[PDB]
From a paper:
Keap1 (Kelch-like ECH-associated protein 1) is a multi-domain protein which plays a key role in the regulation of Nrf2, a transcription factor that mediates the expression of a large array of cytoprotective enzymes in response to electrophilic and oxidative assault. In common with related family members, it acts in concert with members of the CRL3 class of Cullin-RING-Ligase E3 ligases to provide substrate-specific recruitment for ubiquitination, and consists of a three domain architecture composed of an N-terminal BTB (Broad complex, Tramtrack, and Bric-a-Brac) domain, an intervening region (IVR) or BACK domain, and a C-terminal Kelch repeat domain. Keap1 is known to dimerize through its BTB domain, and models of the mechanism of action require dimerization for constructive engagement with the Nrf2 substrate. In the case of Keap1, the BTB domain is unique in providing an additional role in the sensing of oxidative stress.
In addition, we also report here the structure of a mutant form of the Keap1 BTB domain where the reactive cysteine at position 151 has been mutated to tryptophan. This mutation has been shown to constitutively activate the Nrf2 pathway through antagonism of Keap1, and we discuss this structure in the context of both apo and CDDO-bound forms of the protein. In order to gain further insight into mechanism of action of modifications to Cys 151, we also solved the structure of the Keap1 BTB domain C151W mutant. In addition, we have recently demonstrated that introduction of the C151W mutation disrupts the interaction of Cul3 with full-length Keap1 using a TR-FRET assay (manuscript in preparation). An overlay with the apo C151 structure reveals a change in rotamer for the side-chain of Arg 135, but no significant conformational movements with the potential to disrupt the binding with Cul3. In addition, the structure of the C151W mutant presented here shows no evidence for disruption of the BTB homodimerization interface. Superposition of the C151W and CDDO-bound structures shows that the side-chain of Trp 151 adopts a rotamer in which the indole ring is orthogonal to the CDDO ring system, although occupying a similar region of space to the lower portion of the antagonist. Neither the binding of CDDO, nor the C151W mutation appears to lead to large conformational changes, and although we cannot preclude the possibility that additional effects are relevant in solution, or in full-length Keap1, the structures presented here suggest a model where dissociation of Cul3 may be driven by direct steric hindrance with residues in its N-terminal tail.
Author numbering:
A (entry chain A), B (entry chain A): 49 to 179
Write the structure that this text describes.
């Protein structure tokens, strides 16, 4: 004759870890990102639409279009370097971006592009620190 | 000429919140769970295979079968009460189970069934506390 709450704090961190494994194993993926940019060679990025939607309101609006795709959607991406997209996907799955000093401005360009608010601030705060 | 890490701690909590909204709005869903149990009326549960996979190694093994389903898979579920499955899905998306005292044993039955390790322990520790 009572109500009982249990909350595992570490759950989301653990679940995103298994979600990262599935992406790396190319399991349960429904989006492929074909990233072409200037003279850099073309790259493919398999992911889960929901994980991308949860980290990017730009990706959220992109995949929520009513008439659901039967399986795998291919997406063309231009203006973002493939290394930048790789780090933004990694952020979406791991909660962390590690980046070379020379990449920060290009990372923020794609962060603004995909409205990844938190990494826009992280890059902007870093650039001001370099004076 | 340096490497720079940024880590947003709250990211996974925030992303699971948007992931919960999408489930409740029935957006980007790829699994429906038709839960039938004894004399209880039948229920449908729309979810994302990856979120279910990340919280349950039983669901992970269920959906990782090579030949990917073109869109929406319907799953028949028996032996688990629909209120129990509702709370296990909610745990998978929110990291929390709130349950009536009279439900704990039935919750653990489904928690064992879907190998949700953390909620098995939470129920088992609760039942021992009631002597």
């Amino acid at each position: 004759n009572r109500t009982f709450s249990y909350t595992l704090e570490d759950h989301t961190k653990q679940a995103f870890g298994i979600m990262n494994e599935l992406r790396l194993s190319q399991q349960l993926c429904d989006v492929t990102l074909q990233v072409k940019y200037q003279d850099a060679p073309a790259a493919q990025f398999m992911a889960h639409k929901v994980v991308l939607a949860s980290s990017s309101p730009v990706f959220k609006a992109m995949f929520t279009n009513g008439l659901r795709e039967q399986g795998m959607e291919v997406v063309s991406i231009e203006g973002i370097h493939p290394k930048v997209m790789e780090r933004l996907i990694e952020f979406a799955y791991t909660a962390s971006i590690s980046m070379g000093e020379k990449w920060v401005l290009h990372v923020m360009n794609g962060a603004v592009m995909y409205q990844i608010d938190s990494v826009v601030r992280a890059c902007a705060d870093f650039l001001v620190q370099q004076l």
